[PDB]
Design a binder for this molecule. Sequence first.
Ligand SMILES: NC(=O)C1=CN([C@@H]2O[C@H](COP(=O)(O)OP(=O)(O)OC[C@H]3O[C@@H](n4cnc5c(N)ncnc54)[C@H](OP(=O)(O)O)[C@@H]3O)[C@@H](O)[C@H]2O)C=CC1
Ligand SMILES: NC(=O)C1=CN([C@@H]2O[C@H](COP(=O)(O)OP(=O)(O)OC[C@H]3O[C@@H](n4cnc5c(N)ncnc54)[C@H](OP(=O)(O)O)[C@@H]3O)[C@@H](O)[C@H]2O)C=CC1
Lengths: 359, 359
Amino acid sequence: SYKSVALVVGVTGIVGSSLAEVLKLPDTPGGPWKVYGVARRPCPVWLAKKPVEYIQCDVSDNQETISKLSPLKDITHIFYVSWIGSEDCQTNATMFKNILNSVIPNASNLQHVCLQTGIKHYFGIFEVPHDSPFTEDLPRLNVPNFYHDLEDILYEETGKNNLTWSVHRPALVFGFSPCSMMNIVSTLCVYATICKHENKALVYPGSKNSWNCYADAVDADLVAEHEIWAAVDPKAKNQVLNCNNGDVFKWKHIWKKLAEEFGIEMVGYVEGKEQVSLAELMKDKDQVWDEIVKKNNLVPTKLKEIAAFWFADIAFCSENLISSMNKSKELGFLGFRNSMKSFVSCIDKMRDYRFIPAS
Amino acid sequence: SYKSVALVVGVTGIVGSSLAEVLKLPDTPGGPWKVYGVARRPCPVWLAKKPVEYIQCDVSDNQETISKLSPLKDITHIFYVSWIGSEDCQTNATMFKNILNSVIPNASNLQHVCLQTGIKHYFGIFEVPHDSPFTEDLPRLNVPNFYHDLEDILYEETGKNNLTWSVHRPALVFGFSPCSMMNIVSTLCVYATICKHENKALVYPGSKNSWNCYADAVDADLVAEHEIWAAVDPKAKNQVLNCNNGDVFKWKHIWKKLAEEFGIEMVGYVEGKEQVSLAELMKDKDQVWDEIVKKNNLVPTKLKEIAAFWFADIAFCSENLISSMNKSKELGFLGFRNSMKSFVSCIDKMRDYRFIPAS
Ligand SMILES: NC(=O)C1=CN([C@@H]2O[C@H](COP(=O)(O)OP(=O)(O)OC[C@H]3O[C@@H](n4cnc5c(N)ncnc54)[C@H](OP(=O)(O)O)[C@@H]3O)[C@@H](O)[C@H]2O)C=CC1
Ligand SMILES: NC(=O)C1=CN([C@@H]2O[C@H](COP(=O)(O)OP(=O)(O)OC[C@H]3O[C@@H](n4cnc5c(N)ncnc54)[C@H](OP(=O)(O)O)[C@@H]3O)[C@@H](O)[C@H]2O)C=CC1
């Protein structure tokens, strides 16, 4: 007997994996929560030791989704925290439609759908941005951003079925999942771990501007708390909401912290030196990674899975992307984190869980 | 019969005038509060209609301070929210010493001294800065900053007399006092009011960087709340604490808002155009101001009193001065304001109080 029943679509992801932890805490709003977690891969080892009912399901395949999710009649809240690995508006849209079409007719006590998008809503796509600080009310850019498609489906389907909705636009996520397609902290920890292995310094590859500019981020657990808040507090219902840690930082200070955490020398940004691609620097390091994995008895991960060096490249030529938390705060959500501390905490947790070497 | 008795040194100032309002609210921590307000000028009209016992006193004159403050035996908390009008370490230090030397021996139930300094602690003096975001633990710069003198006296005097202390470092203050030596909002409202009068556009005089960079500020009432918090909550005692609104903004967006609030056309920053001095643009506008005052039946103010065009000049060549609120938040203070809204609210309040024209 449970109070609430969550479907977490993307349970292996950087946010879904936090939700799987946060939803099972005793103090969590709306608890006690039962948790169904969906992902495409077979349940990895680390997740089998969690109290989540894992449903292995390719949610881009409609018949499969119907057969796997239509029996789930007790669901009360959906948390869509997934995307396919690309910016295809059509294929991302299919996943979300298949979730709703499979669950809405079958779960008579469904109440709410949380959709997670992101701050790209304000400045465009990875394939003429608004100025910042970004606020929720800013109109859509004239670009094929799959976030637009997902919102439209969200509004259409919740409205005709008398369900409430929320849209969450997190900033860059600080999290611990080694299964994510965009995990900045594990990406940078892997780079550091490789530098250390090869007796090299932690050399910063990015732009001058990304070194020196203000940046913001969100801890995965805070995103989970923010999503859980919008799912249970009537004041938050049917709102588009940004989600960040509530402060700002600079990569320059994070880089120092990173070097210290791995006990290696740092080479910061060098005046006049231009961005180099971390993707290229790490192009054929997969066997090095495989060695470090076996050597340290880590959870086995492939280099391309734990790390997204392409994504660090983007973070390191980005600037002026700060988002505002005023709306959420004026609605009464006062969750926050110290971003420097959240970063270190992600490092610790990935060591703790044995995704990366201790010490 | 009162619970707490506040001495507000600088009661006509941009923060002291907020404290005079905030301390008299029924829900205010530590209330009901009795309020003594000190300033050098005779009580201006607007302040005579407030329930504060006004003590006219030149606090740089020791005998005068002794005779005026030594009878005040019931004081429990001092809020030092004043400075002389300059950066002289010696003359600022005299004021603060004279307050403590006159009150500490005479008020046996004295508990706490709040000292207000500022973010200049981190980057130097108006007459080689730390990088930001500024955190409280950053060491002193090797400069003659009178803030250093005030802290040293604060620590010395509170320690030997078994009193608790706090140091508050607000960001740029958004407030309503027409008696302040550094009131950015009234300064900009005056400029706007003059543009409107002379049928000119609201032309931005500042630098490119100050137009485009992230900036932060603090609402006066929030500073008062922050100071009151540190004065009554044991968790906050004997701490140095930054104070800002909890978000960031850009002058570019504020400028638009300012133009709208005065119904005049805006001319924003123009690429390649260099900073001009607002002090010089307004050099002999005092009779214009005098006219606008009589014409609109405003509280009578001299141009040099309501406005500090020199100070807007500094704000408009400044950048990279963001301060962190993480410490305060981790101690449990979750007060905040929307800076865009706080700015507008200062405008409204100055109209409300008749310091500047309505509409
Ligand atoms: N820093 C970040 O990571 C940020 C992300 N966002 C946004 O948040 C949203 C969710 O992304 P994020 O949390 O990063 O996701 P992750 O890449 O960490 O996780 C993706 C999840 O979706 C699952 N998934 C992918 N394709 C399928 C499929 N066909 N069927 C079933 N499950 C699938 C994955 O499991 P499996 O591996 O088995 O396929 C995985 O569990 C995206 O819109 C993203 O842009 C926004 C801001 C920041
Ligand atoms: N934006 C801002 O204004 C910021 C200010 N700060 C800092 O806060 C501190 C306090 O300043 P702020 O609140 O701006 O002050 P204001 O200039 O608004 O107020 C000064 C107050 O002190 C009184 N005062 C000045 N000299 C004397 C004297 N000899 N005897 C008695 N009273 C006196 C003034 O009254 P009277 O007019 O009668 O002399 C007035 O009430 C300063 O260190 C300042 O740097 C920090 C960050 C931002």
